[PDB]
Scaffold this active site. Structure first.
Site, PDB file in Angstrom:
ATOM      1  N   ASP B 227       0.932  -1.514  -0.563  1.00  0.00           N
ATOM      2  CA  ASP B 227       0.140   0.132  -0.027  1.00  0.00           C
ATOM      3  C   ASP B 227       0.935   1.175   0.160  1.00  0.00           C
ATOM      4  OD1 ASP B 227      -2.183   2.143   0.778  1.00  0.00           O
ATOM      5  OD2 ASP B 227      -3.009  -0.393   0.836  1.00  0.00           O
ATOM      6  N   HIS B 281      -3.370   3.773  -3.391  1.00  0.00           N
ATOM      7  CA  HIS B 281      -2.453   3.138  -2.720  1.00  0.00           C
ATOM      8  C   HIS B 281      -0.922   2.394  -3.246  1.00  0.00           C
ATOM      9  CE1 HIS B 281      -6.572   2.824  -0.047  1.00  0.00           C
ATOM     10  NE2 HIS B 281      -6.892   2.943  -1.200  1.00  0.00           N
ATOM     11  N   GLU B 346     -10.746   3.439  -4.281  1.00  0.00           N
ATOM     12  CA  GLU B 346     -10.319   4.625  -4.207  1.00  0.00           C
ATOM     13  C   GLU B 346      -9.399   5.665  -4.925  1.00  0.00           C
ATOM     14  OE1 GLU B 346      -9.211   3.797   0.078  1.00  0.00           O
ATOM     15  OE2 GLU B 346     -11.652   4.002   0.589  1.00  0.00           O
TER      16      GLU B 346
END
Ligand SMILES: CC(=O)N[C@H]1/C(=N/OC(=O)Nc2ccccc2)O[C@H](CO)[C@@H](O)[C@@H]1O
Ligand SMILES: CC(=O)N[C@H]1/C(=N/OC(=O)Nc2ccccc2)O[C@H](CO)[C@@H](O)[C@@H]1O
EC number: 3.2.1.52
Lengths: 572, 572
Positions: B227, B281, B346
């Site tokens: 991430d 991420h 996201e």
């Protein structure tokens, strides 16, 4: 496989930078940067007096640390045990798997105990110390701890161990070169309550808890050893209580085990304070005695706040013979405690009114069956129990009761007095009862449930949803909870505070996570009472968490480690 | 120091009674009572087909259990490993410190694997088994497990080990005498997501997680390995990613370590499924490549949902060479997985719009700077990344993406197709997106955050208060969360579910508590899809918790042990 990064201090934040080879500036490891970038370095709790850490670190040889006791006395065994434990503490700076280079200066630790005979726990005990570190000659270090008692001295050793840092870039063990620290706690009572009746806790886990407590200078382990769910305390005089009451024959606390825990605590400046909760919160173990009422009463919601119900029958004279024996057995093994907790939370009127033997007793003694007269029976109980407690410990000693209907400040003086009874507050920190009690001269232990109930937040254990005092209380909230604010001008009457771990949903397996690092937030609040808030302690809190993990504590995780390596980037 | 109590079944509840000596009725230990008092005994998960446990127990000799493989094949090593592990599993009935008497019957376990060459993970794999236990001769027991594959057979061994009970009154190891069980899971994908990028998890802790997964027949470990916070995955082809990206040189997952975990999983019927989350991420590890934008962008709230920000730059051709190499290195060591997770949660438009190189690329390719055209860039990225993924694994294989702006059912078909992409749902279980996706033919993995986000409930990790998806989700809520209800008539398109342990506030120390026993509630829901609710599983859930603790798992505590010993008295 060596670390690729270095850190540099910028506006109170250690910023991660590439350790580029074309540089004449010595690279700083993360911890080395933190030690001087932070106002209080890596210390937890921060000191209350002098906090001078200087500007430099010295490379030291792990195998060349020598501790010297300068004043001998009755605490010789405690001082020697604490000294032996020092090397172990220092190795906590070194991450597991890493080995420091055996080079650098030798460290001479000098321990000066001004009153080397003193080893009793008391609310008036002196926990202050002075710590000075300076170079000695060309080849060594002089670390001198001066304290008025063993307890202050032990705290000084704790602080001193926090002045070591491992440089993982160079594999060097480092120590702050020039230190002047003076320190003493704001509050004398700094506690954790452990409920070992709602679930059993291995004595290994209890000792581990004490280790972590001592690491942040907490000094009181409040052992809530019995309740309605079980009786694990081994009473030699009334053996059926634990035989019938224990969850299993192995889930017990023998005299030898309790002595072990009490001594382990003493060596680490931790008072082990027993609670026998009465007259409610009794049940298992009391079968066949006829000394309880409502045990397992159904529907439980009509008779108690949580199952199983069960209360002592104060009208039975034999009860006080049992009580005398329990208290006496407790006094024998809990022999460092200066205080006894007698519970007194949540007495049910409906439960006592359901008994005909109790009703007959009150009718004969002119009392009615209304809610007011049941306080008379409670007083009758507590007075007789108090007498047995004094007899057991062989002296008048301070007694603790929870806030309850009995301790309502409006009528508390009809039943108790401020000299004999300390009140443990578990109402909200804004509850009118607190100011009321303080204005009547009562001394308090703060365990306000909105900030100090460490069991809150998890699933329901009866029915569904979440447990009663949810949400989960973050360390930020426990840190900001200030007894000084709660008590104002009457704050000297606050003896301190206590994080409560009730165990309906906690046992051996979850103890480390429940308590740590949250109890460290309480530790600093009670030790230092900072005017600053959690934000100003955030970075040091992240470090103390890592220190607990290095100790073998399965501490809760607070933030991504990335945040710890990149101060200032994680904020809201 | 022997147990003082006995238990007797009354209306589906084991009631604790004094074991009085003047009785001709044989006393039952707690577990022995539970085994027959409960509809499904001590089994977890309960079987889906035949569940006949009979009425009796037989005393068996621990040292006289022999496992016999009746059909040899390519899975010989897996079957022999699973068989060797059986004695160890059986000893889990015996509490630590207790030793059974070495008397009683011998147990012959016969393993019949109908297709002994089959060892590949697939969504179509056969996890069914048949289990029969009956007396054999006068002196022994015949336990026969019949399954279409090793995976079914391994599940059968798990169930069989749960048919042993320790009588702690007599110190006897007991086994259910007459058993007929047929069983198979409702859903083929039964998972746990472990985020090992927000915090590091020791490979020891990962293997321990797999052990507990296999105990309740969970079959998928979704390893969210990278991430923005760290890159612990050791890429041999792009070594700077982990050199710059790891939290430390030791906080890494080498090829040898991953191979160890993957094999450990295979032996236990657990698919180890890697995720490389892209194009958001990402961050740490990518320094000096110029292949990311917004890494550590401030203020972070304008550019990402959590710090540090960071996204891949899809306009750089070199990026897909890095991606090909990462996926290829992953494919090499994650060589049991049939599926690849590519993240896609996201993606920030503001982050991509802040880059001039990205803006120039879109202006040259006629696209505007509005929110709609950024989906075109995302599609461009995902198409090229997909190609590299197929090349890496050397085949077209199912890919997983999180629900996001991209997967909005209204336009999903413009970008993806239902045959190539499985969607992992983390919206609420009532979100309109679920029905929409199902009506477009998409297959789903259920991880709805209101029931399956195991990280929810704790303190804030940025600022104060509690974390975003609080309150804490109790096992009752995860148990009652039904994919069959969520999906209705389209439920065959639900491949299963997955408990998500995001690790902003979890690591090695907290893993056991975070996952267990809550993931067992998911385990039964996905294995059995019971029409009954949590209340009907409550007693067996309390037992499986105790079984995890016996395994060495630091499982969460659900209720006072008193409740487990006194069924029916703890209710709301
Ligand atoms: C002094 C105290 O805290 N007493 C009990 C206690 N009393 O608090 C409540 O009365 N909680 C409650 C409030 C409303 C409904 C149900 C329970 O809480 C602890 C758990 O947090 C129990 O373990 C304690 O025995
Ligand atoms: C798919 C997913 O869950 N993505 C992120 C994620 N996204 O959820 C949110 O957007 N949470 C959120 C909602 C409002 C405000 C701040 C954060 O939640 C996890 C933690 O629960 C993170 O670890 C994940 O990276």
């Amino acid at each position: 496989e060596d670390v690729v990064w270095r850190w540099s201090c910028d506006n109170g934040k250690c910023v991660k930078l590439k350790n580029d080879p074309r540089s004449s500036e010595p690279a700083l490891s993360l911890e080395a940067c933190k030690m001087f970038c932070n106002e209080y370095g890596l210390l937890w709790p921060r000191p209350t007096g002098e906090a001078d850490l200087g500007n430099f670190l010295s490379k030291i040889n792990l195998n060349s640390i020598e501790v010297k006791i300068l004043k001998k006395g009755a605490t010789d065994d405690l001082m020697e045990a604490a000294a032996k434990r020092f090397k172990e503490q220092v190795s906590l700076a070194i991450p597991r798997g890493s080995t420091p280079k055996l080079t650098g200066k030798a460290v001479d630790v000098y321990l000066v105990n001004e009153n080397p005979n003193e080893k009793a726990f008391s609310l008036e005990m002196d926990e202050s110390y002075g710590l000075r570190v300076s170079p000695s000659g060309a080849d060594r270090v002089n670390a001198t701890i001066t304290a008025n008692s063993f307890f202050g001295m032990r705290h000084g050793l704790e602080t001193l161990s926090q002045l070591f840092v491992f440089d993982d870039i160079r594999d060097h063990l480092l120590m702050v070169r020039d230190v002047n620290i003076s320190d003493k706690p704001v509050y004398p009572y700094r506690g954790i309550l452990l409920d070992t009746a709602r679930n059993y806790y291995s004595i290994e886990s209890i000792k581990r808890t004490i280790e972590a407590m001592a690491a942040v200078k907490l000094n009181t382990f409040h052992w809530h050893i019995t309740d309605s769910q079980s009786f694990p305390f081994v009473t030699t005089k009334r053996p059926n209580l634990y035989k019938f009451g224990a969850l299993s024959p192995q889930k017990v606390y023998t005299k030898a085990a309790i002595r072990e825990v009490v001594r382990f605590g003493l060596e680490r400046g931790v008072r082990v304070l027993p609670e026998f909760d009465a007259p409610a919160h009794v049940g298992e173990g009391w079968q066949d005695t006829d000394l309880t009422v409502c045990f397992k009463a159904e529907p439980w919601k009509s008779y108690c706040v949580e199952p199983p119900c069960g209360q002592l029958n104060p009208t039975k004279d034999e009860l006080y013979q049992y009580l005398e024996d329990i208290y006496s057995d407790m006094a024998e093994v809990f022999d460092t405690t200066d205080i006894f907790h007698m519970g007194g939370d949540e007495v049910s009127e409906a439960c006592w009114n359901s008994s005909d033997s109790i009703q007959n007793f009150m009718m004969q003694n002119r009392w009615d069956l209304d809610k007011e007269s049941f306080l008379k029976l409670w007083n009758y109980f507590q007075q007789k129990a108090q007498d047995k407690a004094y007899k057991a410990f062989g002296k008048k000693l301070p007694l603790i009761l929870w806030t309850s209907t009995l301790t309502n400040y409006k009528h508390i003086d009809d039943y108790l007095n401020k000299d004999d009874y300390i009140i443990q507050v578990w109402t909200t920190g804004v509850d009118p009862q607190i100011k009321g009690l303080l204005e009547k001269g009562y001394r308090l232990i703060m365990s306000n449930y909105d900030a100090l109930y460490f069991d809150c937040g998890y699933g329901a254990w009866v029915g569904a949803g979440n447990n009663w005092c949810s949400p989960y209380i973050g360390w930020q909230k426990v840190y900001d909870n200030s007894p000084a604010v709660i008590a104002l001008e009457h704050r000297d009457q606050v003896l301190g505070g206590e994080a409560a771990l009730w165990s309906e949903q906690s046992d051996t397996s979850t103890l480390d996570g429940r308590l740590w690092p949250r109890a460290a937030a309480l530790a600093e609040r009670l030790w230092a009472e900072p005017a600053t808030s959690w934000q100003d302690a955030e970075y040091r809190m992240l470090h103390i968490r890592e220190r607990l993990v290095r100790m073998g504590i399965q501490a809760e995780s607070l933030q991504p480690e990335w945040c710890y390596q990149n101060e200032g980037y994680c904020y809201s």
